[PDB]
Amino acid sequence: LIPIVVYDIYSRLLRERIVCVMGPIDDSVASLVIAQLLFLQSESNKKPIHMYINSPGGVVTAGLAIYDTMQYILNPICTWCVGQAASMGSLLLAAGTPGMRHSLPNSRIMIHQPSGGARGQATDIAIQAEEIMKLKKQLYNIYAKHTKQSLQVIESAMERDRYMSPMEAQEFGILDKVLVHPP
Amino acid sequence: LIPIVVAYDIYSRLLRERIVCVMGPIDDSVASLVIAQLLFLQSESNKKPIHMYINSPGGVVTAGLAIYDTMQYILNPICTWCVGQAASMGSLLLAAGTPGMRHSLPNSRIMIHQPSGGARGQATDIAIQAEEIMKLKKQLYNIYAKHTKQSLQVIESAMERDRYMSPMEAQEFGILDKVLVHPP
Amino acid sequence: LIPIVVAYDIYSRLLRERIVCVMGPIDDSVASLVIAQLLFLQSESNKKPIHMYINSPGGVVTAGLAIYDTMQYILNPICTWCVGQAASMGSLLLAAGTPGMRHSLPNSRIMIHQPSGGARGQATDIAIQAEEIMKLKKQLYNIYAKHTKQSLQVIESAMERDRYMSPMEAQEFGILDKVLVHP
Amino acid sequence: LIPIVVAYDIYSRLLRERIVCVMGPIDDSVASLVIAQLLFLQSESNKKPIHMYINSPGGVVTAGLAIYDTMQYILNPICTWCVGQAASMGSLLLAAGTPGMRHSLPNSRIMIHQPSGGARGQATDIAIQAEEIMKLKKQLYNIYAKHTKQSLQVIESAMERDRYMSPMEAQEFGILDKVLVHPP
Amino acid sequence: LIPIVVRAYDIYSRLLRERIVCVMGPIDDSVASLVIAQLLFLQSESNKKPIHMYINSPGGVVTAGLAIYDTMQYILNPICTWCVGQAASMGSLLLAAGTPGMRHSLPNSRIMIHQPSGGARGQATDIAIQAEEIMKLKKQLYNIYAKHTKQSLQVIESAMERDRYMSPMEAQEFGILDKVLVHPP
Amino acid sequence: LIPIVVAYDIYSRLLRERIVCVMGPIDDSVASLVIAQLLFLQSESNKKPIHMYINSPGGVVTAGLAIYDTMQYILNPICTWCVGQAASMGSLLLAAGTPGMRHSLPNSRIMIHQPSGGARGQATDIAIQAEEIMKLKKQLYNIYAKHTKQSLQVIESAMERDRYMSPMEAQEFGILDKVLVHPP
Amino acid sequence: LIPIVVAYDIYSRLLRERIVCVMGPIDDSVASLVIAQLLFLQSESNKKPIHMYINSPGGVVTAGLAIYDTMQYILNPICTWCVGQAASMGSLLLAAGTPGMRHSLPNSRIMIHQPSGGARGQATDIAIQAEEIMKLKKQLYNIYAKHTKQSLQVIESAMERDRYMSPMEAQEFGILDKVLVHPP
Amino acid sequence: LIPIVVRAYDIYSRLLRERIVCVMGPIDDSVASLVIAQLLFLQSESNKKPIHMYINSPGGVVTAGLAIYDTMQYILNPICTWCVGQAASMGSLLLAAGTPGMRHSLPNSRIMIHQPSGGARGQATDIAIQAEEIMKLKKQLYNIYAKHTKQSLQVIESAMERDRYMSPMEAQEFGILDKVLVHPP
Amino acid sequence: LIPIVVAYDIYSRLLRERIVCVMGPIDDSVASLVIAQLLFLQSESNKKPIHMYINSPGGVVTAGLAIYDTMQYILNPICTWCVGQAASMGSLLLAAGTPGMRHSLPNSRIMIHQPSGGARGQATDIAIQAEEIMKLKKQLYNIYAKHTKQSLQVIESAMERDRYMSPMEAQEFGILDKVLVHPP
Ligand SMILES: O=C1C2=C(CCN(Cc3cccc(F)c3)C2)N2CCCN=C2N1Cc1ccc(C(F)(F)F)cc1
Ligand SMILES: O=C1C2=C(CCN(Cc3cccc(F)c3)C2)N2CCCN=C2N1Cc1ccc(C(F)(F)F)cc1
Ligand SMILES: O=C1C2=C(CCN(Cc3cccc(F)c3)C2)N2CCCN=C2N1Cc1ccc(C(F)(F)F)cc1
Ligand SMILES: O=C1C2=C(CCN(Cc3cccc(F)c3)C2)N2CCCN=C2N1Cc1ccc(C(F)(F)F)cc1
Ligand SMILES: O=C1C2=C(CCN(Cc3cccc(F)c3)C2)N2CCCN=C2N1Cc1ccc(C(F)(F)F)cc1
Ligand SMILES: O=C1C2=C(CCN(Cc3cccc(F)c3)C2)N2CCCN=C2N1Cc1ccc(C(F)(F)F)cc1
Ligand SMILES: O=C1C2=C(CCN(Cc3cccc(F)c3)C2)N2CCCN=C2N1Cc1ccc(C(F)(F)F)cc1
Numbered sequence A: 001l002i003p004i005v006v007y008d009i010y011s012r013l014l015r016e017r018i019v020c021v022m023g024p025i026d027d028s029v030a031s032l033v034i035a036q037l038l039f040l041q042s043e044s045n046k047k048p049i050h051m052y053i054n055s056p057g058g059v060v061t062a063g064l065a066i067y068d069t070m071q072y073i074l075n076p077i078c079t080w081c082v083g084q085a086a087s088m089g090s091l092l093l094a095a096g097t098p099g100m101r102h103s104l105p106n107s108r109i110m111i112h113q114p115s116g117g118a119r120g121q122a123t124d125i126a127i128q129a130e131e132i133m134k135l136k137k138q139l140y141n142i143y144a145k146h147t148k149q150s151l152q153v154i155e156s157a158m159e160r161d162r163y164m165s166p167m168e169a170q171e172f173g174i175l176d177k178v179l180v181h182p183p
Numbered sequence B, D, F, G, I: 001l002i003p004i005v006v007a008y009d010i011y012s013r014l015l016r017e018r019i020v021c022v023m024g025p026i027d028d029s030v031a032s033l034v035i036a037q038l039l040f041l042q043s044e045s046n047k048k049p050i051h052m053y054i055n056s057p058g059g060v061v062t063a064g065l066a067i068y069d070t071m072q073y074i075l076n077p078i079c080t081w082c083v084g085q086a087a088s089m090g091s092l093l094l095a096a097g098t099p100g101m102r103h104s105l106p107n108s109r110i111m112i113h114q115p116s117g118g119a120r121g122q123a124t125d126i127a128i129q130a131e132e133i134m135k136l137k138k139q140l141y142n143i144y145a146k147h148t149k150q151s152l153q154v155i156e157s158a159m160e161r162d163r164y165m166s167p168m169e170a171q172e173f174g175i176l177d178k179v180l181v182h183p184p
Numbered sequence C: 001l002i003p004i005v006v007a008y009d010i011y012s013r014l015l016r017e018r019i020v021c022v023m024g025p026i027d028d029s030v031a032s033l034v035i036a037q038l039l040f041l042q043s044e045s046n047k048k049p050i051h052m053y054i055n056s057p058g059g060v061v062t063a064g065l066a067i068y069d070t071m072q073y074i075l076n077p078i079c080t081w082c083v084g085q086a087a088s089m090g091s092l093l094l095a096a097g098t099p100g101m102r103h104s105l106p107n108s109r110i111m112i113h114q115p116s117g118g119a120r121g122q123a124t125d126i127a128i129q130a131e132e133i134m135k136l137k138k139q140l141y142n143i144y145a146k147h148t149k150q151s152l153q154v155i156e157s158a159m160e161r162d163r164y165m166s167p168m169e170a171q172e173f174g175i176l177d178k179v180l181v182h183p
Numbered sequence E, H: 001l002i003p004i005v006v007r008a009y010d011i012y013s014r015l016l017r018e019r020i021v022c023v024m025g026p027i028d029d030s031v032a033s034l035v036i037a038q039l040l041f042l043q044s045e046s047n048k049k050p051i052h053m054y055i056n057s058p059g060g061v062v063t064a065g066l067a068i069y070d071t072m073q074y075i076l077n078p079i080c081t082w083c084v085g086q087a088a089s090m091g092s093l094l095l096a097a098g099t100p101g102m103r104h105s106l107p108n109s110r111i112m113i114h115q116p117s118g119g120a121r122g123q124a125t126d127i128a129i130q131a132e133e134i135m136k137l138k139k140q141l142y143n144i145y146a147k148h149t150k151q152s153l154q155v156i157e158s159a160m161e162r163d164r165y166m167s168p169m170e171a172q173e174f175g176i177l178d179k180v181l182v183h184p185p
């Protein structure tokens, strides 16, 4: 299944201070990722942490749970985009420590405003819609914070799905370095 | 298996007596039929009263408002009659009858509530969808306040949840005018 | 129950008053029936006006444009009437009535939006399908600008997302000319 | 639901005007109805022109070729009219109208492409099935070149993928002769 | 949803007045019954005036087709077969069972002949019985095709082991039909 | 896909730190485990605090109250922490932490609402079923009022519909005590 | 059940030989596992060559491009071996092996073809997805041209439809370097 | 649910210690990977000691089978093939690709060979490409069967046009296996 | 769920006693497990008898014939024991035990019948499929006559339909040798 090395390969990735946030994001991934982060901080709260991101997005609450944990812990977090980073995946990618957010050369990065659904009486529709616009402003604020772009530019760029290449994402402020090979 | 009476079907004879049936759920198909019946009876006579029998659980708001607009357009006096139950858009159509000519049989049930709906898509689309349903709420409440002569406030308070009324209670509320066991 | 009226079913009697019903979703079957009704009423009189009652949520785009092309082809003036709601292709048919004879009942709803679609298959096929959906987007916009007399810029702005309008707002936009509550 | 006019149904009245409708997907059932209408209209008169209204997304090729062969068989001029859309077998029947009498309303879409199909079973059966549809590709390309006056090369280049055209783009390709906003 | 013409019939009953029977679409026991009633009726109005069968079928149930076949041969009238669009499986059989010299096809039709298919399930005795039945069937149909094509059983066995698709002109050479018709006489 | 740490699994390692995870919907299994974990931690120490990480959209009400009753029973200080989301019974357990030790991360969402349910069967059964859901409404309202220090009237008004709060709003309402953007 | 050979399961034993298996469809789950093995083998030695056995019909393009970016990143020579078949993303990883070290067993099949996808929603969204698919096609076309040394016209021409190759044909095209019937 | 024997393994890992690899059951990419790892491992423990393949398969994915085939020919060891119960489609190919003179079958097994099947959908260009591929495949496998059976392609083309079922003794005459084994040496 | 006894699982302990279980439907997977157990027990000792417990409703014939050929291949005496039921391929394996060492518990049911199958496709394919299963009928009848010492005629008469037997009725037919209530 998962290969054993010398002790399974994924626990071996955890010893190198590497956390994988690959695949769709839900509360289960949040629980696992958060527990990995808190663990690495207890072994060393100063030695950097590497988060390998290859995700299409996922549940918004779950991602913001991972986000708050990245910002909470004292370690530098190195984010690395592998394959794809879309929706909340690009949020985790951008929340890496400044100057420590990376991408491999052929990745794709995409940002967009949240989606949702509301059913029920008009009052319930009214409440549910207030919540989705509060969410839209919340995620927008976070992107502007870590991209150092105006909230204004974020609003324009995220109204629809905006796809970027590693270099386009660097200029936009999503990542800092595009790496074809080890330094 | 619609019965034929003496050479008509029972419903075509009912249209001949100037009687329109609004029974069952209301959708555009029901609207289309009822609208055509009303416009036809008005061409025969724009003075002779028209009778509507309502036994509906409600249905699509636009379709109901199409019937509502048609009731208001035609010049005839319209007699509404609640049979069994009149809920949602049914209670609106019932109350939209000509003043003094809105009726109910003794064991009927009447129900009003705010509209319901659904929104899907991006947050931008949700905002748009949600704006429309609050506008519909203000539209239907305004119509109800008009024909009950009640305050918009009472309207809101009552329609926030499902409020079931008895024929007798709906007469106090302003939905109908008369509760009838036998003809006068 | 289609009622029988005095020897006529209620819908054939409506056709005798020169009234054509476009209620419900629009598909090739609806386009077929409406087109046949228009050509017939033009054969009884190529001058006497025809009345189109609209209560539609939209539907198949080609079918709608088939009806639109017929309204413009026949020589009669066509009076359109929105009852209940006329949205998407319904509002186009509403606006395609002859100027000054486009009406609405007081509590109707009118809505306009850009077309939606789907593409599947190889990258080359996706290119072709999207070029087609864009051409349709320009096609419907040009038709909408024509009958509302609104600038193509306003139409582009107004139809990027869904626009719900009241009878009066629609009059202002140029979709209809008259709002009525009584004869 | 078809309206009744005087006294027949509106589609039978349209056949009275020498109008055949080819709307909707094309299968052997439409072929029966279309073929029977054409052969009948010829017995009424082998010279009075016949009008075909096309609003079709395509369909079964043999059924379409059945109509094509019948269009060619009868002696009458055939006026084709594209309304809404004519794609796949529809654009063939549209283009097969009598030269100079092939029409389209201004906002139609016209589309041409090579046939699609499917094969299953042993390799030997697949080989047969693959030969049979290359034969159709050569057949439909030939018919299109014949009536468009285009070269087979052009047909081959144009029909390798879905090629969507505007009414005037098809007039230019040889698919129709006239684009009409209003009656001449 | 059938148009009504001219004393006023539906277009299909008007076709029957012209002595034209449609065997268009798939063949099942319902189509067999309808075609058989139409054949017996037209010989009843005239047992000599030719009868026309319009064929545009992909095949269907074998017994149903052999039921139509047996009636065609039974009635006294000449039967003119016309392939329109397509005639495959039993459809080509009915096409070829027309009276000699009066079997026609429009220019772009397709003709296809093939051996029968079937299925067997159950105990072995049963499987055996069923396969024997299918063999006897292949043989029957092969013999019919030979009789009407005038081809030897050897050519038929070779030609129908797999799906054999033909053009009208190929069908005329093979012996399934006699005339191909580009425009009227 | 659970990693191993030095040698336990990360989740048994969290129990090693006296940290209990209440993530996901709350059902009877979750409750079982959480209760066991809490009791174990009490066994290991009657004084050292216990930490609950709450990231839940709600779930079965009895199940949630089973966890609640356990929190109040055990003597340990209980630190509650909202991560991601704490809604329905999740917000109840969050507010049920020991006073002064209830926390939330900056971008969490908190939501409170009255219970929902269902009734089917005879009128007598509906009456009985409906009496119980009003009893939970009063029970859950009382619990919330206790730990938020809000009057029962303010709770009743706020929980009639879904009430969403941010961490700060929740601090003001009385659900949590501190909003942490980083360690102290 | 995967056998134990000594104590190792045979797949961990293959990782011991610096052999990574890329068999089956490629998705994000394979990508993590493939990437973790590649990164691990480089830490055992950034010089001892790594062998990838490829028997894949393709899969998600981004997931495959994740493996590709990793192959180019690490410093080791990577030996690619086509076993059975390498189609779609499989032939790209295959062609991305270290120059001079890309292999295939005698009876394998190789296929290269342009990416496929889907777009749904408003025309505005359709444009975005259609632009994204065009960039993917140009991106993968560039990658194939880099490692096959073929000009971009030849790639566009060869990948417009499904292009199937034999080991000797793929060797000529530039996808692999050696076809082996036996060890040397 | 595998029994554990004798330092204590499961019965299947104990079979691998005897240099016996099972290709029993249908063949897919998973079976190909498992068999390939087992072959490469046993040549690694000994590249000379013979390897035994137990075959009881109804066939499966063609590429997967040709993947196992290519490995059998690649490794240096003699491979002894043993047909147990049944070997049909690719299963008989793996059976016949054993090293000459070491291809065996138990007395009541069945061997069946047949041409490949497949499917094609889409536009015509695509159908064409796909059928070409299937043809090239028939040819490939036909060539393999000839090489290991020593039969001419003409005999193979004739023999595999339809499902050809054989007895062990018939398979020995045809050239698929060398020895039939009633009881041990 | 299998109990653990000393220390192994109860089925591995049963293999220690030289007991192979053939319970449940027989397919190629049971054949692998049964065949591997027999070949393994022979390497432990080619003379110590082996016991097969049969409680089976039949199954795939080739899988059953795989076990039959292996039973014959090994040198050991095989004691067959019918427990519960042995029908279709089960009664063959039961009767194929070493002469004089084939047993049944008192209340078992034993059944023999001719094989069943299925054929689909062109007539020519049906002919092949029908030949193949008449070959199995002749094969299984022969094996049954061999071990029952019955004539093929009797086998043919008995197996044309389902023939159910009691333990003593099978001893008499040649299917087993001993019916045992209690240990001798
Ligand atoms: O970090 C903490 C935290 C707390 C309580 C606060 N909470 C804040 C928090 C909560 C949820 C998500 C976050 F992002 C942050 C952080 N407590 C309390 C118990 C003793 N320790 C700790 N620790 C060290 C610790 C943790 C886990 C492991 C583990 F790896 F073993 F699981 C080892 C050491
Ligand atoms: O009874 C009425 C009734 C009205 C209007 C009041 N409504 C009250 C009502 C409604 C529903 C249930 C009830 F218990 C009572 C009774 N009107 C008005 C039109 C002329 N006539 C009538 N009649 C006689 C009549 C009816 C039907 C036919 C017909 F179905 F045969 F056509 C002929 C004559
Ligand atoms: O009422 C009208 C109306 C129009 C055009 C306006 N439109 C306004 C309207 C539209 C939709 C819903 C409404 F609420 C109001 C009313 N026109 C125009 C043609 C001649 N007549 C009419 N009439 C009389 C008429 C109707 C129907 C029958 C029939 F039922 F017998 F068919 C006979 C006579
Ligand atoms: O309008 C025409 C048209 C044609 C030829 C097509 N051309 C073009 C056209 C325009 C717009 C939409 C279309 F789809 C097609 C219109 N032709 C030719 C045969 C005689 N008449 C006509 N007419 C009169 C006519 C129609 C129908 C009925 C009936 F429905 F009552 F039967 C009576 C009279
Ligand atoms: O055109 C023919 C045809 C034949 C036999 C040949 N066949 C050839 C053909 C051509 C194209 C497509 C086909 F599928 C078949 C044409 N025959 C024979 C019986 C008398 N008439 C005719 N007619 C006139 C006719 C038809 C039908 C109606 C009716 F449907 F209105 F009844 C009236 C008159
Ligand atoms: O055979 C090889 C092969 C390579 C690379 C080439 N490749 C080509 C090949 C041939 C046939 C089928 C295939 F799919 C691939 C064969 N390499 C490279 C790493 C060191 N060794 C090897 N070996 C020995 C080896 C294998 C496996 C085990 C183990 F299973 F025990 F781990 C030990 C030793
Ligand atoms: O390669 C790295 C890499 C990093 C961080 C950068 N990242 C770049 C990268 C990321 C994703 C895909 C790529 F293609 C490339 C590569 N770091 C940081 C932690 C210490 N080590 C490493 N190493 C050696 C290492 C890795 C994993 C194991 C494991 F086997 F334990 F999992 C052992 C040794």
Ligand SMILES: O=C1C2=C(CCN(Cc3cccc(F)c3)C2)N2CCCN=C2N1Cc1ccc(C(F)(F)F)cc1
Binding pocket: I010, I013, I014, I015, I016, I017, I018, I019, I051, I053, I081, I083
């Ligand atoms: O009872 C037997 C029996 C046999 C031969 C079968 N005969 C007949 C039988 C009776 C009742 C139900 C049956 F299904 C079968 C019973 N044989 C032969 C091999 C050595 N031993 C035995 N034993 C002792 C034995 C069993 C099992 C365990 C174990 F489960 F612990 F492994 C230990 C010892």
Ligand SMILES: O=C1C2=C(CCN(Cc3cccc(F)c3)C2)N2CCCN=C2N1Cc1ccc(C(F)(F)F)cc1
Binding pocket: H011, H014, H015, H016, H017, H018, H019, H020, H052, H054, H082, H084, H106, I035, I036, I039, I040, I041, I043, I069, I070, I073
């Ligand atoms: O019986 C054999 C057999 C062979 C090769 C022939 N084959 C013929 C055969 C007969 C019946 C059914 C079959 F499917 C195959 C029998 N070989 C070759 C490798 C060394 N040994 C053996 N043995 C002893 C042996 C087996 C297995 C275990 C183990 F499973 F416990 F590991 C230990 C000892």
Ligand SMILES: [Br-]
Binding pocket: A057, A060, A087, A088, A112, A113, A114, A115
């Ligand atoms: Br999102």
Ligand SMILES: [Br-]
Binding pocket: B058, B061, B088, B089, B113, B114, B115, B116
């Ligand atoms: Br409502």
Ligand SMILES: [Br-]
Binding pocket: C058, C061, C088, C089, C113, C114, C115, C116
């Ligand atoms: Br639209």
Ligand SMILES: [Br-]
Binding pocket: D071, D072, D073, D074, D075, D076, D077, D078, D098
């Ligand atoms: Br013509």
Ligand SMILES: [Br-]
Binding pocket: D058, D061, D088, D089, D113, D114, D115, D116
């Ligand atoms: Br086509």
Ligand SMILES: [Br-]
Binding pocket: E059, E062, E089, E090, E114, E115, E116, E117
């Ligand atoms: Br057939």
Ligand SMILES: [Br-]
Binding pocket: F058, F061, F088, F089, F113, F114, F115, F116
């Ligand atoms: Br709740």
Ligand SMILES: [Br-]
Binding pocket: G058, G061, G088, G089, G113, G114, G115, G116
């Ligand atoms: Br691809």
Ligand SMILES: [Br-]
Binding pocket: H059, H062, H089, H090, H114, H115, H116, H117
């Ligand atoms: Br095969």
Ligand SMILES: [Br-]
Binding pocket: I071, I072, I073, I074, I075, I076, I077, I078, I098
């Ligand atoms: Br033996």
Ligand SMILES: [Br-]
Binding pocket: I058, I061, I088, I089, I113, I114, I115, I116
């Ligand atoms: Br059996």
